Amino acid sequence: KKYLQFVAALTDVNTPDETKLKMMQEVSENFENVTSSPQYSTFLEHIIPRFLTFLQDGELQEKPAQQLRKLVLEIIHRIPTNEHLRPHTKNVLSVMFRFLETENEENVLICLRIIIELHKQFRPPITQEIHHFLDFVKQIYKELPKVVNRYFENTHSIIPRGSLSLKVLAELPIIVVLMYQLYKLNIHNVVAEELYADFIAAQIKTLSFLAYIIRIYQELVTKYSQQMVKGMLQLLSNCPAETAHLRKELLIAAKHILTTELRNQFIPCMDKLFDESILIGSGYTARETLRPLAYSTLADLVHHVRQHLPLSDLSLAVQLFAKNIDDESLPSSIQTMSCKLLLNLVDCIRSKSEQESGNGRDVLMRMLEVFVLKFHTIARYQLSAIFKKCKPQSDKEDKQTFQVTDCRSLVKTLVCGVKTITWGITSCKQFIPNKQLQPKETQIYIKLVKYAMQALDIYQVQIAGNGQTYIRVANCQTVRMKEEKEVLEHFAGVFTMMNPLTFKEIFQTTVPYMVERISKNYALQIVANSFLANPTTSALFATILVEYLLDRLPEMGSNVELSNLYLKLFKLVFGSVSLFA
């Protein structure tokens, strides 16, 4: 019935307003109702002449032209098959070329949508008309400068559609030389700059253009246009902050460009690399939820190119990063990535300290300060957060488990970074090997050990087979799955390498807290074992421990816990004496 119903309703101009909408409803019903093979192709063969005669007439308008374009968009939505796709191609590419880059309606948008949905069939012989479309693309891209240069202070959605259409139409077919012409267009790209909303629309047109220029992350091309990409990066900083989705897509396109070696080496020499995590790569005052992606991109960039940055660049980079390392609103993953970046950059700063009279000691100490501050903050808050939900004597809990794991990895990354930093300040600024630390960094290290002996307590929480967290026992004499053994071994290594008579003061001041935490956390006993096993540091630590325990001997008769702790400590002391007689 659909056939004879849609055919009898044939009406050109006798009823322009509502008859076309009724036929649109009828064809929508036809599309929602299944059609058989005998009622499949003839429908389209009849629709095509109808679409032709309806587009022949009626080229901010709200006239029957609108419902005509809507009927066309529905015929597009059909997507029945491909056999009858040839004349529709001609009609579409004929209606595409005219009345573009002007105050035209969305007719061209649905036109590019059907063009995209059309080339999926891989039609060889239609490459000539799409080649003419690419010639029109050449025209409009070269015309863009004049367009923005004619509209001054005294729509705009066609370029993104055309760009994404050309992208999806150049990705599927055989690789041809037309992409090199599109590259030459990227050389002629526009780089200069409610009507302000239209200018921002032009900015996002340029952003979509760049998104198409992402091809720089593909087969190599002759890149002799650094000035154009620099101007585009400037426009990016000039882009609006209210649009979150477009800014996110722009940051993605940027990080994709920065994901190749031949493009990274040209970034640091641009504006002295001052355009880092300062409020350029993120919304100025609108939104900062996409901050993780920008921070990860910047971290990867600075990591790949750290070997070519002077003192000022790395100093201000650390200044900008230490600010976000402490941000509680960011997920702990970003904090771990920033700690990794800092501990990987510490070695580069140390190696570069030979130049420009050094000046690295100050920055290294100032970032060791933020490292110990993060240690203290996590030992103060993360430990409490987990202890306030432990199930003694054993969904949001699934995510709390991942958070606990992120904290368990964060403590390890912090320990490793602190070790690498201790290796740093003791090997730069002339320089004298094993220089005695000054009182400032000595007290900083005292507080560092005092706060890290607590952060290491995160390894006393376990995950059960039902999802609920479980608090570990006080003492079980196990291996702890080997996860934390290396962590506290590196924690001890941090101190095994420093000056002997500074170790002496640090541990003479912190030995009571050490035994206290060991009694409250038996896993820390290996720290003393590592101190006693490392040469050049076992004698001092053993002497301090015995001098502290000889006065606390009567305390072994009161309770059994501290008595056993002191017994194990004396056993370790005797083992060390046997090893370092």
Partner: protein, 527 residues
């Protein structure tokens, strides 16, 4: 001997004096300083380090005393002065690579908080936000944030909530003298509402004042609101939600159609303006909350529903999901005479999606999936979602969204059939079962051979299949002979012999149980 500027500027003697005053037996040393607060005034102004030294000593004194607060008005008159001074902010922000005096802000904020917690100074308490969320943050955030989050909404407004809110509103005048935009004016909305909610579970004049004082686009100047708009919308939402109910709201909201909340939210979220998704969707949520409790207007609820459905394009997930959770049960209950009307409007907006807008379709599918309980009476609308799931599962769902959404949408119809039988299009249900059979044994290959997630969802899909056969929908299920053959015959090709066949074996075992219930399948085991 230590307070001599010549010796007080030296780091060595200053550190020595700090360590001495920090000692436990420094009681008499602290008293001689508490007896002369004017001394610090001469230091709290190249000799700029004396400011930091004085701020450090004051912090030690405050920490060791905890009561020398009411006697230091003349001191805080200069301590707060440097806190709010733009010179301090700039000097400490511009260059902070390796600059000394790094802990000055933390101690300054600490002593300011210690002073303001003994006497309730509104201007000082609100100016404290200069480093609570905005400004500079190096260990300075949490110490004050946790206080304002837990201690403030515990005993602060136990007696004068209304007067305190009026003072915080009158703060606009002194605030505009030094801070004109969200950087402070937006943060002041948090300290008040933690208590407003803690005690929201009493202040009528404040409800009337907030509406008229903060007229739509306050001061008739929309250009200055960037983030304050979102927090004001959240204020209005949680206000119409908990603290003032109809009893207190209807008194002044009778003029909703006027400059009141309704017009404060509707024109911005309706028009294409306010491209910022946050403010637009927060206004949508405010309208949803208003509709949920009162304001039964001339069918504008359907307009809001449509604007929400068509607008959740890319990243509106959280806010639109909350707005639907708050509004989805409101429209049908208050549209009894238009149940069929709203359902047909939903169908319309669904069929007008011929572009298929993959992300929009996924968002709509998730929306209709969350509310399983509100579409049992519209079985007519299952064909569209079933046909959409069929094509969703066929796409290369390397991403997490498509096929997981498809399998949970299949679980949706499973539960629908469960509640229908134990209080449907037969061919489409058979196709749904065949799809659950196909997708269940197809996701096993999406993940690598081993050492990766993706198997728990396959197991839960197998459980869904096991459970879907207990209802009386099993008799017409079709055997996927060709799919099973192709997948398990892969073993003939030693490449790609992953456990996918093992899940296929478990599914063949489930169908073996089915034939154990109905031996008719014996004739279908030929393949």
């Amino acid at each position: 001997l230590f307070m001599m500027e010549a010796t007080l500027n030296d780091p060595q003697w200053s550190r020595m004096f700090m360590s001495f005053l920090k000692h436990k037996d420094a009681r008499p040393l602290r008293d001689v300083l508490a007896a002369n607060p004017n001394r610090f005034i001469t230091l709290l102004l190249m000799r700029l380090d004396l400011q930091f030294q004085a701020i450090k000593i004051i912090s030690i004194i405050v920490k060791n005393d905890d009561s020398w607060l009411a006697s230091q008005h003349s001191l805080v008159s200069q301590l707060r002065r440097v806190w709010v001074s733009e010179n301090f902010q700039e000097r400490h922000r511009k260059e902070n690579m390796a600059a000394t005096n790094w802990k000055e802000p933390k101690l300054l904020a600490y002593c300011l908080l210690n002073y303001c917690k003994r006497n309730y100074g509104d201007i000082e308490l609100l100016f404290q936000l200069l480093r609570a969320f905005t400004g500079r943050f190096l260990c300075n955030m949490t110490f004050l944030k946790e206080y304002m989050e837990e201690e403030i909404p515990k005993n602060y407004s136990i007696a004068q909530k209304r007067a305190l809110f009026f003072r915080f509103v009158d703060f606009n005048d002194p605030n505009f003298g030094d801070e004109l935009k969200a950087k402070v004016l937006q943060h002041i909305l948090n300290p008040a509402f933690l208590y407003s909610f803690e005690k929201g579970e009493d202040n009528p004049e404040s409800i009337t004042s907030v509406f008229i004082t903060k007229v739509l686009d306050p001061e008739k100047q929309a250009d200055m609101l960037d983030s304050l708009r979102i927090y004001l919308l959240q204020y209005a939402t949680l206000l119409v939600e908990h603290a003032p109910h109809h009893i207190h709201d209807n008194n002044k909201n009778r003029n909703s159609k006027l400059r009141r909340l309704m017009t404060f939210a509707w024109p911005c979220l309706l028009s294409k303006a306010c491209v910022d998704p946050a403010c637009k969707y927060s206004g949508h949520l405010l309208l949803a909350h208003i509709i949920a409790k009162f304001a039964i207007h001339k069918k504008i609820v359907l307009q809001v529903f449509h604007s929400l459905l068509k607008a959740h394009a890319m990243e509106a997930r959280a806010i639109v999901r909350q707005a639907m959770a708050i509004l989805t049960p409101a429209v049908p209950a208050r549209m009894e005479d238009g149940h069929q009307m709203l359902t047909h409007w939903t169908r319309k907006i669904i069929v007008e999606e011929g572009h298929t807008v993959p992300q929009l379709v996924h968002i709509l599918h998730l929306i209709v999936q969350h509310f399983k309980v509100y579409y049992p009476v519209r079985h007519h609308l299952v064909q569209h979602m079933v046909s959409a799931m069929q094509r969703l599962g066929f796409t290369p769902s390397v991403t997490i969204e498509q096929r997981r959404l498809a399998v949970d949408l299949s679980e949706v119809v499973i539960k629908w059939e469960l509640q229908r039988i134990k209080d449907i299009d037969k061919q489409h249900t058979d196709t749904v079962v065949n799809f659950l059979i196909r997708v269940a044994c197809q996701v096993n290959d999406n993940t690598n051979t081993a050492g990766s997630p993706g198997e728990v969802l396959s197991r839960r899909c197998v459980n869904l299949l096991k459970t879907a056969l207990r209802p009386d929908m099993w008799p017409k299920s079709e055997l996927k002979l060709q799919w099973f053959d192709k997948l398990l015959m892969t073993v003939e090709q030693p490449n790609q012999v992953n456990y996918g066949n093992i899940c296929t074996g478990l599914e063949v075992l489930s169908f073996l149980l089915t034939v154990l219930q109905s031996p008719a399948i014996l004739s279908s085991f030929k393949p």
